[PDB]
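Re: the multi-chain job from yesterday

Posting the exact lines I submitted so nobody has to dig through the queue logs.
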Amino acid sequence: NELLHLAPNVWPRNTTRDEVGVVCIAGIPLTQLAQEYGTPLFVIDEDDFRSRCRETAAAFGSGANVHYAAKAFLCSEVARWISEEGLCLDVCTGGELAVALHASFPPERITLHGNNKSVSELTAAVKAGVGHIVVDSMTEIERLDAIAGEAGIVQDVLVRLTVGVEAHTHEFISTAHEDQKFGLSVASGAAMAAVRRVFATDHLRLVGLHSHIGSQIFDVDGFELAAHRVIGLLRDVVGEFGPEKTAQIATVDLGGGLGISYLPSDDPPPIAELAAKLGTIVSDESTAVGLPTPKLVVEPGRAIAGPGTITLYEVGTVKDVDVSATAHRRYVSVDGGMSDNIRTALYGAQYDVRLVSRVSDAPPVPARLVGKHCESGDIIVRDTWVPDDIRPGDLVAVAATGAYCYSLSSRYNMVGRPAVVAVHAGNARLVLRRETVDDLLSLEVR
Amino acid sequence: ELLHLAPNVWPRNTTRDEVGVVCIAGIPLTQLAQEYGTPLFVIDEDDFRSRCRETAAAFGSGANVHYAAKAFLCSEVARWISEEGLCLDVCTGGELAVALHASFPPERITLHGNNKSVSELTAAVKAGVGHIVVDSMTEIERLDAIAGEAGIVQDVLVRLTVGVEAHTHEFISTAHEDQKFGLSVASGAAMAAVRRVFATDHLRLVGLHSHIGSQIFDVDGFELAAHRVIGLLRDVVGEFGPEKTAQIATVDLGGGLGISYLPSDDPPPIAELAAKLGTIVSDESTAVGLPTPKLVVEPGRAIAGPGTITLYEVGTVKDVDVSATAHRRYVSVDGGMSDNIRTALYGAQYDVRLVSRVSDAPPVPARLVGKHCESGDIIVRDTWVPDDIRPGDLVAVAATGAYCYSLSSRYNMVGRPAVVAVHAGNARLVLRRETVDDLLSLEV
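And the result, structure tokens for all chains:
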């Protein structure tokens, strides 16, 4: 009756119900998937994922202007999808680049990020020919210049700014002095010094500016102020170097944080609308300081992976726990835990969970979804509702685990990484194996 | 200044060189890094064993001290626990698997968890584990059926909610504890379970279990939790006679025994704390006309933990403006929330020290920070660092042997650090560092 609704903004785009009531994506009952591949189980609506890539690219005007943030989720399958849809790939560490490359991701379309790039990570990057690197310290700059000189090239490059804006959901914060590890403060002059240094080198080309201001951003208001501040730096730069030189700073990358719906209440604007406001502020602001509007880049992770994937669990214990003299909370324990979605513990994230293996007529009862580890804080969905006849053996699913869940997974209490599976049109295909005690034990020595 | 290495915090066999490099078990940390890489976990093996011994003594027997494998586990460690006479609490299908691959005596394994699978329970009676601490009415059915099918009578404790949560020098009491483990005494769910276990032919009740906290520095919480637990025992004499309730011979007050993360952390010496604890189990027992039951305790952190250190190489130093007039020194490092997530996840606080040389520079306020693309990737939120700290320098964070490695992740595709043990003069790789081959190993 009430828990039977599967809100189309939360759950993947190809999700539907059986005639027997079972929940399907891409036409596959979740039961079949569970019985075939085990639980816990990650289930990626492949068509959804591409769907998001096309949609975002259309909104910003080309896949060249949308870099998938690999940090949300990465494996060779997904890299290949991103290539095919024509987006770029932002990679973060040595290893994210390694796997990008292993999947033959076109290096010209990679951008490298990080607060502490090593000389090896940077050297590997120029060898492969990555093409954009977003620099983050003055040390990085001295380091990359040496490396690109040593290798015969001029490495295009952006500098990362700290612009004093933090945005989440329908609000933002502005600070005099942003206190965090990334970027170079515009207000402090650190950013300008960075611009100066790169212009000065023989071996780097300054090509853009990068800002990132938060996550689950549902209004443009924060971006607007950020872009204001960011393009104000550009004004400082016409100041010293002239308009002709500063046009070479052709790309304003406004970072990630494009929002999705974890709960049906969540109301991120449709992406084309947002992007058109974004485009317009980059333009108003651009010309009211005497410049050609530079090209807008955006780096979603969550808004691309994320909605299209679902973690599929089997209920194993149901305990009814007294929380007042009169009331109860219905703890439903499950197959996995913080080993595969640590976001609830770590960020206080809020998820939708649903019985999926059947349809119940029972009245909804307040509940906590809870995993299998020896920590009381091992909690996947802190507050929901759940049909009062929920019972071991049932299959439940949590609704936007596509982003930052698997990437964050651990082997806490020796629980191995769930399998991951992709699904497209009717067909299912294992993408990522499930761990076994052999993996568990495989770093041990004699 | 930042030069003191507080002996309550750092591993026991920690030392300084003539040249001022920090050493443990006689090995300079520079050498370890140059041999094995960074980031690196470094286990002072004698420390671990020392704490095994010290705890055992305090509670009368290694048998009354069960190591909590959740805090860190591998065959090597399983093997240290076996050799020091302690037991092993394991939590999941996987933790038993490895304890067994390491040939840990099953008599000395206790098995925990809110949501044991049929298949987990089955594996464990087949291995002859010996104690299971049941958590749900459902689990009790499952386990009767299973032990019956095996032709055995499986010893068992039940786990209780007793409405106490202790941390540091305080604790909260609650009319109705609101969390996943245990069965409530006050609702009489506990007593319902004691009935149903007395009723089966295939289970046999030998104790009660409460776990009430972490980083516990007073006895007070334990006193109240004990009062309340043994309260159940009285209720069972009421129903069953004192002569069949004495079969419930074991009161297990769980883990939570505390260590020093920071120098100002001041947990009591375990010998005192256990004396105190033993007295009150006794008092509270005779206070209800029962034989003193045996006190068992299930530490993880207090055993693993203080003897292990995470060695990092500095990569980036950045002065960050935080007011018109102040600055915070962001020192970034080889690793991050991938190998130490406790800071982001629980708001833990750590000590960190410059370790590859000794600086005469003055101290400056700082943040030790990882290399992952997330601004919350912070290893140590508020420390002090010497003002001439500089890339190339090696720092160590100070009590990382518990919960850090077991929670490790491959975030941003950062492989697990290697783990190395050092024992009188001598290093030895135990767990090896992950490679992109590992990172790719689940792909098809």
